[PDB]
Write a protein that binds this ligand. Structure first.
Ligand SMILES: [Cl-]
Ligand SMILES: [Cl-]
Ligand SMILES: [Cl-]
Ligand SMILES: [Cl-]
Ligand SMILES: [Cl-]
Ligand SMILES: [Cl-]
Ligand SMILES: [Cl-]
Ligand SMILES: [Cl-]
Ligand SMILES: [Cl-]
Ligand SMILES: [Cl-]
Ligand SMILES: [Cl-]
Ligand SMILES: [Cl-]
Ligand SMILES: [Cl-]
Ligand SMILES: [Cl-]
Ligand SMILES: [Pt+2]
Ligand SMILES: [Pt+2]
Ligand SMILES: [Pt+2]
Ligand SMILES: [Pt+2]
Ligand SMILES: [Pt+2]
Ligand SMILES: [Pt+2]
Ligand SMILES: [Pt+2]
Ligand SMILES: [Pt+2]
Ligand SMILES: [Pt+2]
Ligand SMILES: [Pt+2]
Ligand SMILES: [Pt+2]
Ligand SMILES: [Pt+2]
Lengths: 173, 173, 173, 173, 173, 173
């Protein structure tokens, strides 16, 4: 078997493949979120762009994990990608809540894999995750929390008007 | 009669002239919509510009149909242009509803003429319509539906304030 | 009624709306003239461009009148637009004669409205017309008279050849 | 047989090869027309350039059909190219009449092939023709009709002088 | 239901959602193909880049279909994405064969949807497919057939050496 | 008859027309060679480009002969163009052999026409041929012989691999 593989456990290899699946599932969820907000009857362009941008980020995450798998001499294995949890995502507030739940599940999977690398004394894996994933997730989750707070503040006031204003003055269009 | 005319039915020729009339009538409607929103007592500049831009688009549509009529060896015939359906157009919401009704009637006339070209085996006509009209209308109708949704969301909240915000933050001024 | 309206008679307001109708009717006439000269069996491109340019000028005239109506606190009212007086416009000479008749009728309507503003002591109206319409019409009518004379001189000589030469060497293509 | 071929009938394949032959024959006809007008005893440079340009266009047409044949997995088959219908082409008027007859025969062959693709449910073929051939032919035929009308108008007047003027002031040199 | 929806059958709407699923499945297949050729024990960089580029193209295809679904007033519905048909893809020749099979299945789904639009008299759908999908697929399938032929020619000769040469001199790296 | 014609024999005039036919036939042969190498099942792009370039060169040759015919006061006469000698052209080696045979037949026709001009004391004809044709043919034939030798050397070794390498490293793509 692999001429290059060194200090790379089968446990980490398998967990990397599961993490790829989770990032691709997250990408798919954000594809559905983005297009929902592009519906003529929802029509929040800045919200659509925010979630489409995230779909791209998550796919890049997956590709970065697949590159690393190959660099370490593991073998990429792909599984079915489960469809997103909803067909319709409600308001900007419901959507951003669903997004933060999703990100925290990714984050926990990152932290789990880090703990696994630490238990296996795999410092390349730990650095890979620290360098490309853990800080990015923390920053994103904070940004989503900031958004949450602003949406909440706006839609407690007047729901339709608040949602419009958030999309126009916070989100990029 | 025409030295150039080939595979161009009198049925299509007549329907092209009717379509020109419909596009010019639509142009005229958008001229009246634009100037209504320029009244001192309505004063929504972005709304006026949106409908004046559409008046231009519809006239360009007509001119493109007239050019094609001549390219195929048909004879342009002009009829009276009926005045717009209203003298006053209500709110931005009433106006945008009237506009979408209008666009869908144009779209249906396009689809009718396409079906006629298909029944007459006139593939130049079908391509002409597909290339310059059918996609443009679908895109415009979607944009108007997006606008509808945003206006509705805003004016359900607080009517005057919502209309102002839409004009300032969505429409071009 | 109007918060801005000052020294603006209902007589002038109504006459402005009639003048808008006349300018739009003139625009439409020039649209039909232009496309007639684009027929494969007429094919005088410079003549088509001359009349299409005039269609644009007359529409701009109307829009300028509508802008002013709103600036003075009057209310734009649109009426049916009668179709052009002919379906076919004969030779370049017949067409240019029809155009000069048309321009002189516009000019007379301008002069009538000026006399009305003067009788109503409406010096903004009189200046508006002097500044944007009366000189433009005089210049255009002169240009059309110049064209008339040159066409006449050419087609008295040899009709087909003369018409060709005028289009090629006087008109823009 | 072909690893790529999909939804591509032998009927269309054969008709594409016939159409290639017709476009190459048309190219050849325009080569002979161009050089006829370059004779010292005909000497109408703008006429020669107009027909040589068309020889190029028709060859490009053929090459575009051959490219498509290969893209669909058909097999290009070439046949003898019949010589042009005349050795001498008369006046600019006779020539332009012969050219329009030729173009209408190409156009009819295009329309026939389109009807064949439609009967075979071959929408790639129909789009290929619509996109690259049907509009180009309609535009060319119109241009030739415009030219016809202008030549006729000029040579009814005075034949030699008219032909000279057309070549100098309409055609490119 | 939809304020914009016009001439858009539930049959087409559903088939568009299935086509989106097929394009995303194809994207996923090309992701697995690309990373397989990035393995240390396969190591054909140009092959990896070719299939990763295709993964991008197919995702863009899906996004373009989702955009259109929304433009027509249909509702995007996402389903599970089945994993690729293989975990390991053999030689460059085996891979390129699998790719052409895949493309032809996409192409057939496009042709099926086109036939459905034609039966439903939905000319916007037919033009959408013709303009953005049918020609692209035909061109891609031809390119893959060209590649097939060259790989075959090379690996019949000497398998390892041939595969290397193809990757170095035909594929982009 | 011709006001310009001087020292131009009917024998040369006729032979010039035959030479035009031979150059156009050669052009056509190279059109068929080029597209054969564009087939999905042959797929040698550099070979296709080499022969298409030659199709252009031969047509330019013909046009240069037709220009000269007219400059000397002869009359261009066109005949049927016989189809190429084969429908399928075998390997790059078979094709390049067929091309060199073809070029040598053109060259011999050039040399024959030169001998005819020399016997008729037509030094303009002799210079025309020397200046634009004899050196070009010698250079081309040498280039084809060089290609022959390289193809032979490569395909004696390993036929498929050799053909690929020639196309990639000698021919332009
Ligand atoms: Cl990133
Ligand atoms: Cl699921
Ligand atoms: Cl660390
Ligand atoms: Cl436009
Ligand atoms: Cl009415
Ligand atoms: Cl102006
Ligand atoms: Cl009337
Ligand atoms: Cl072209
Ligand atoms: Cl014959
Ligand atoms: Cl089509
Ligand atoms: Cl693309
Ligand atoms: Cl599966
Ligand atoms: Cl050359
Ligand atoms: Cl033969
Ligand atoms: Pt790193
Ligand atoms: Pt956008
Ligand atoms: Pt077009
Ligand atoms: Pt403005
Ligand atoms: Pt002024
Ligand atoms: Pt023009
Ligand atoms: Pt195309
Ligand atoms: Pt020239
Ligand atoms: Pt489109
Ligand atoms: Pt690379
Ligand atoms: Pt020379
Ligand atoms: Pt190329």
């Amino acid at each position: 078997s692999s001429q290059i593989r060194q200090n790379y456990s089968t446990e980490v290899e398998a967990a990397v493949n599961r993490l790829v699946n989770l990032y691709l599932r997250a990408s798919y969820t954000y594809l559905s979120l983005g297009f929902y907000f592009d519906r003529d009857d929802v029509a929040l362009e800045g919200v659509c762009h925010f979630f489409r941008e995230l779909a791209e980020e998550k796919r890049e995450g997956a590709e970065r994990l697949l590159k690393m798998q190959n660099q370490r001499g593991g073998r990429a294995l792909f599984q079915d990608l489960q469809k997103p949890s909803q067909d319709e995502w409600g308001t900007t507030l419901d959507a951003m809540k669903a997004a933060i739940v999703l990100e925290k599940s990714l984050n926990q999977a990152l932290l789990d894999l880090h703990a696994l690398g630490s238990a296996q004394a795999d410092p390349h894996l730990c650095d890979f995750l620290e360098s490309h994933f853990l800080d990015e997730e923390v920053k994103l989750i904070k940004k989503m929390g900031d958004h949450l707070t602003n949406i909440q503040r706006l839609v407690g006031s007047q729901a339709g008007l608040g949602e419009y204003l958030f999309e126009r003055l916070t989100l990029k269009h």
